[PDB]
Amino acid sequence: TKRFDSEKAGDREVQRTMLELLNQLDGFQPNTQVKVIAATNRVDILDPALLRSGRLDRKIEFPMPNEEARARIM
Amino acid sequence: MSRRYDSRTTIFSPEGRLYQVEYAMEAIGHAGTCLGILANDGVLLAAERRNIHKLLDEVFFSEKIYKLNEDMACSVAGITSDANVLTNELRLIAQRYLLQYQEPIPCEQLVTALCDIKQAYTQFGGKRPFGVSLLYIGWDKHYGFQLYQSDPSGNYGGWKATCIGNNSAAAVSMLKQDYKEGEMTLKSALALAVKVLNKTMDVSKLSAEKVEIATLTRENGKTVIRVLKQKEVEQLIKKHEEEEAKAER
């Protein structure tokens, strides 16, 4: 996660690695044809640069289930 | 509010004395020396005025000494913002008691009433105590002449000669030797008072602006509260330097 003003620690190997995904991810270096299946329980901790539509185009929800959905699993 | 911003501001310690109160004593130390000495016909307060700079209109009588009532006076050592809330209420309670009762206000009575408000802040409310220790000088028809001290917590002790401000510890020690509990006339008492300011204040030449001595003496059957004049303070200082040279070699 980028948000650093860290002069006290905070590694910044980790800073490079999130930034690098964007780099690969811009159109200049192809990524049109390859899909990335991204998964997170918390999108409540991420930033918009990594997420946000048209960088990872489709955004698929899975809301809580209901009785029929319970019915088929059982 | 929030409970993560709470580690309990108000709480009891197992050592029995609140963290915020010990922290407030250091602040009292910082402000200048305020003392009270007893006479066998008066009581007086001697304090160094917060101001020392050239610039001062001199609208108050002295920033430290507040003339509360016609038989009571107090001085403050510590936080001046904190001083204004206690001194204004003080002014009202001391005054109501002399005025109505026709019986001069005891220091012992006064302190217990004020200390209740100070204390409430330390035990509950999430608050913090006052930054000042106040020295009350007065005369009551009960005990006689008195001097009282109050502290941030709302703890009191009644002395008859005490000093607070910087070099407090040294001062009270000097005071024990020369004064016990009554032996000095109004003039010796006043000489003693100038002496304590002298050691403790950096400037040992002093000035009428730098220090202020206000006396309370019952003269001609009525209790008189007066701020001494710049001339009168200056005459006491001039008399004290001659005697300073001779006393300590």
Partner: protein, 205 residues
């Protein structure tokens, strides 16, 4: 500065003027109903120690409200090293009586005092809870207001000294006590210099 009734065994104030001094003369009377037992107890009070305010009627609330007013006068007197103005205190008293709302108990204030640090003569009476009363003439007040008013016109010496006003006033008080139950019961006469207060206590039942 509302006092219960008027029955205080005496109610009378007279104030009379000179250019060299100004005087406020008062019953020193105490003790409610016809029966008195005492003839001493404060009623006129020095508030800057050189101005007076007189509060008039029954003892308890007269002494009580004066003192509670004294504390607000004092606040203003305390902070600055010069003391309050007479004109500003004059509306202050007017308001203090007014705070006690409609169908109030009747006091009768008399303020006598030279103005502080702007030097001109001042006499005023309040009564009820009423409109502003600044005068520079003369004022007499109480429930037997007419009887006092007569006397307040009577003493002015515009050119004699302070002393002649006192001796004139002693006769003025006495003749008034034979005319009403409001004067008398001992008389305190206050000649007020600006720098201090002189209290004289007159011989007269």
């Amino acid at each position: 500065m509302s006092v219960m009734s008027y029955n205080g065994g005496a109610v009378m104030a007279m104030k009379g003027k000179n250019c060299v001094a100004i005087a406020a003369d008062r019953r020193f009377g105490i003790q409610a109903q016809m029966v008195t037992t005492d003839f001493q107890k404060i009623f006129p009070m020095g508030d800057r120690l050189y101005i007076g305010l007189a509060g008039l009627a029954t003892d308890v609330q007269t002494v009580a409200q004066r003192l509670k007013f004294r504390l607000n006068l004092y606040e203003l007197k305390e902070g600055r090293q010069i003391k309050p103005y007479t004109l500003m205190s004059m509306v202050a008293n007017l308001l203090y009586e007014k705070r006690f709302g409609p169908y109030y108990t009747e006091p009768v204030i008399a303020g006598l005092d030279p103005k502080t640090f702007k030097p001109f003569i001042c006499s005023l009476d309040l009564i009820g809870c009423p409109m502003v009363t600044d005068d520079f003439v003369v004022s007499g007040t109480c429930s037997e207001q007419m009887y006092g008013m007569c006397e307040s016109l009577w003493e002015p010496n515009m050119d004699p000294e302070h002393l002649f006003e006192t001796i004139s006033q002693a006769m003025l008080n006495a003749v008034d006590r034979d005319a009403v139950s409001g004067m008398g019961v001992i008389v305190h006469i206050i000649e007020k210099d600006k720098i201090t207060t002189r209290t004289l206590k007159a011989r007269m039942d």
